[PDB]
Amino acid sequence: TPCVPAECFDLLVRHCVACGLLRTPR
C-alpha cells in the first residue's frame, strides 16, 4: 500500500509528495 501515481515517494522528506511538485514534467 505505497504512495500513488499522484504523489511519489521522495527521499528528501522521506514520504509521498505531489510527483514533481512542479508544473508540467518534461
UniProtKB/Swiss-Prot annotation:
Disulfide bonds join 3-16, 8-19. TNFR-Cys repeats lie at residues 2-19. Highly expressed in spleen and lymph node, and in resting B-cells. Detected at lower levels in activated B-cells, resting CD4+ T-cells, in thymus and peripheral blood leukocytes. Changing residue 19 to S: Abolishes a disulfide bond and thereby changes the specificity, so that both TNFSF13B and TNFSF13 can be bound. It is found in: Membrane. Residues 10-15 are annotated as: Essential for TNFSF13B/TALL1/BAFF/BLyS binding. It is linked to Immunodeficiency, common variable, 4: A primary immunodeficiency characterized by antibody deficiency, hypogammaglobulinemia, recurrent bacterial infections and an inability to mount an antibody response to antigen. The defect results from a failure of B-cell differentiation and impaired secretion of immunoglobulins; the numbers of circulating B-cells is usually in the normal range, but can be low. B-cell receptor specific for TNFSF13B/TALL1/BAFF/BLyS. Promotes the survival of mature B-cells and the B-cell response. This is Tumor necrosis factor receptor superfamily member 13C. It comes from Homo sapiens. The chain holds residues 17 to 42 of 184 of the full protein.
